[PDB]
C-alpha cells in the first residue's frame, strides 16, 4: 500500500530499505560492500541524485520494514512529542502500515 496521509503533513524518509523501486523502474541494489541504485546506513540506499526530465513527484513502492517521518507543513505546530514514525509490518500474511500519532494545529 502507501503510507497513511495525515492532514497538514508531508511524510519523508531518511534511508530506503533495499528493494525500493522508482526503462521500467530504478532499483536499490546492495551487497556487503555497499549499496547503490542501478538501471540509470548499511542495507539502505541514499537518496538518488537528480536526473533531468524529472517528474515533480517521486513515486516509491516500499518493501516490508520501511521507516518514515512526519513533518507538519509550514504554518502548523506539532501538539504531541517526538518525530512520528510509520513502519510496514507483516501481520498474518497481510501487508499494512502502522498508524502515526500526530496532529498539526494552527
Amino acid at each position: 500500500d502507501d503510507p497513511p496521509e495525515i492532514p497538514h503533513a508531508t511524510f519523508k524518509a531518511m534511508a530506503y530499505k533495499e528493494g525500493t523501486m522508482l526503462s521500467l523502474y530504478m532499483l536499490c541494489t546492495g551487497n556487503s560492500s555497499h549499496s547503490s541504485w542501478d538501471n540509470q546506513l548499511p542495507g539502505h540506499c541514499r537518496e538518488p541524485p537528480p536526473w533531468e526530465n524529472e517528474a515533480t513527484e517521486r513515486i516509491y513502492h516500499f518493501v516490508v520494514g520501511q521507516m518514515v517521518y512526519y513533518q507538519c507543513v509550514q504554518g502548523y505546530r506539532a501538539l504531541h512529542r517526538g518525530p512520528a514514525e510509520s513502519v510496514c509490518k507483516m501481520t498474518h500474511g497481510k501487508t499494512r502500515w502502522t498508524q502515526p500519532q500526530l496532529i498539526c494545529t494552527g
Partner: antibody
Amino acid sequence: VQLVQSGAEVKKPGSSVKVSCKASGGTFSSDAINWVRQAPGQGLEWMGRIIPIFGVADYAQKFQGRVTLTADKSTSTAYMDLSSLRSEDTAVFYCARERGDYSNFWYFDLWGRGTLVTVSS
Amino acid sequence: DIQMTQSPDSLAVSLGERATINCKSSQSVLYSSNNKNYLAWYQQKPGQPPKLLIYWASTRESGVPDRFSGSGSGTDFTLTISSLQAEDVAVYYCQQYYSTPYTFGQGTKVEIKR
C-alpha cells in the same frame, strides 16, 4: 535568522525591568522562545516558554508569579518582565528558539547574546 | 521534574587525552515509539552564549568536530572528548527536553591539567 536582544540595565531594588528579544528573520513561525537565566558563577536555569503562534505560555515552578512573558506578532518580538526585584536577581537572560514542526519538545537551535541586569542601590 | 546530576563537578585531564563526563536522570528518557533518547549536551565557553553540541544523545550536530561523541542510553548517559585540544576548555551541560520544565545540569568545568 538571528535573535537580537536589548542592552544592559542597572536598576534599583523594588523596581521593574523589561527585556526584549527580536528575530532578524521573518517571524516566529510555529516556534517557541525559551528563556534561560544564569546568575554569575552558577549553572543555567530555565524560566519558561512562550509559543507565539499559540498565545500560550508555560512557566517553571520556581519563578511562577514573578515573571510575565509577552510576544508581539506585528514586530515579531518576545518580552520578559520582572516584578519586585530583589538584590539577588543579578544575572544574564538568554533567549532560545526551538523549532516545532517535528515535535513540541525539542532542542535549542539558536541562542541570543544575553541581557545583563544588575540590581543594586 | 526530571533532574540532572553531572559528575564530576570539575574535571582535569592532560592535553590530548581522553575525557569523560556523565549524566543521570531521575526518570527514564528513552521514548518507546521512537527508541530515541531526548538528551542534549551544550558547550558554553566563558562570556558567550551556549552552543548546541550533541542531540538525541548520539547525533553529532553539523560543524562539530568528530572527536566529540555522545553515548549511553536510558539514564546513564555520557560524553567523550577524545584527544582534547586547547579549544575544548569550557563548561558542558546536560538538558532534559523529554518534558517540561526542562532541567539543566550542575555543569562540569573541563580544565586542562599540567
